[PDB]
């Protein structure tokens, strides 16, 4: 269901926006989770170029610089 599907998100930063914040962080802090941004919500939080539209150019061009040399 739409409401349940959204509840599962890879980025832990996104979840603490609209889910219950206390639970999200705890579950994530023990796991040692690494958030790579990639999604929209989190990039707005941290205030950089949205990884779509005009920003897609930048994020794409920078994502490839990663896992490389």
């Amino acid at each position: 269901g739409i409401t349940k599907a959204s509840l599962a998100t890879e980025s832990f930063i996104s979840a603490a926006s609209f889910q219950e914040t206390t639970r999200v962080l705890t579950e994530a802090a023990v796991a040692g989770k690494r958030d790579e941004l990639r999604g929209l919500k989190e990039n707005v939080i941290v205030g950089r170029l949205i990884p779509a539209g005009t920003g897609y150019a930048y994020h794409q061009d920078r994502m490839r610089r990663r896992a490389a040399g």
Binding site: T3, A5, S6
Partner: protein, 201 residues
């Protein structure tokens, strides 16, 4: 019309076209002097007749209730139907009178065409108001329902060009307030639904 302009000439010409439509439509609308006065809201000549007929129809179902031909719960929904019908008769009565009855002549004898009555031009074009709302200005305005939801078995027989009386207005009250109450929440319901949807997309 605007649509076809897009799919044939492209973005730019459609845009500037749409400007011309607005500028001109406003200008000639002003020249037209369309307005609205009391005499614009033409009541059907048959209205008072139609009521007394369906009003006597209730007098049939009444005779049967007191004489036990029909049962009590039954009788409520019987009368409510013969009223609900008469309203559809009154509605398409004024709509036949209002629509075409400007009867005018060209050199020869007689002819009739779509009316040029002010309040009509508005609805047929689609500028504002609909036969639903018009039905409340000239014809009677429907049946209302008490807070229950159970639509009341003696409709609003008056319209807005006439007065309403004490009771008729008081009955009209419920639907208005629930109307406001609902759309206050029907605003919230949209808002919550769209919110859930972007979270998953």
């Amino acid at each position: 019309m605007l649509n076809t302009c897009y799919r044939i000439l492209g973005l730019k010409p459609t845009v500037i076209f749409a400007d011309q439509i607005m500028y001109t439509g406003f200008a000639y609308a002003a020249r037209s002097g369309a307005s609205v006065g009391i005499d614009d809201m033409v009541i059907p000549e048959k209205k008072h007749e139609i009521i007394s007929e369906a009003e006597a129809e209730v007098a049939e179902i009444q005779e049967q209730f007191q004489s036990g031909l029909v049962t009590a719960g039954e009788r409520y929904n019987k009368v409510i139907d013969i009223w609900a019908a008469a309203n559809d008769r009154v509605s398409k009565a004024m709509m036949d009178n209002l629509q075409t009855e400007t009867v005018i002549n060209r050199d020869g004898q007689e002819e009739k065409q779509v009316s040029f009555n002010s309040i009509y031009m508005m609805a047929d074009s689609g500028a504002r108001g609909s036969a639903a709302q018009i039905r409340q200005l000239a014809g009677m305005r429907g049946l209302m329902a008490k807070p229950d939801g159970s639509i009341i078995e003696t409709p609003i027989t008056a319209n807005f060009r006439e007065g309403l009386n004490v009771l008729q207005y008081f009955i009209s009250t419920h639907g208005a307030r629930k109307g406001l109450a609902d759309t206050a929440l029907k605003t919230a319901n949209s808002g919550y639904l769209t919110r859930r949807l972007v979270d998953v997309a």
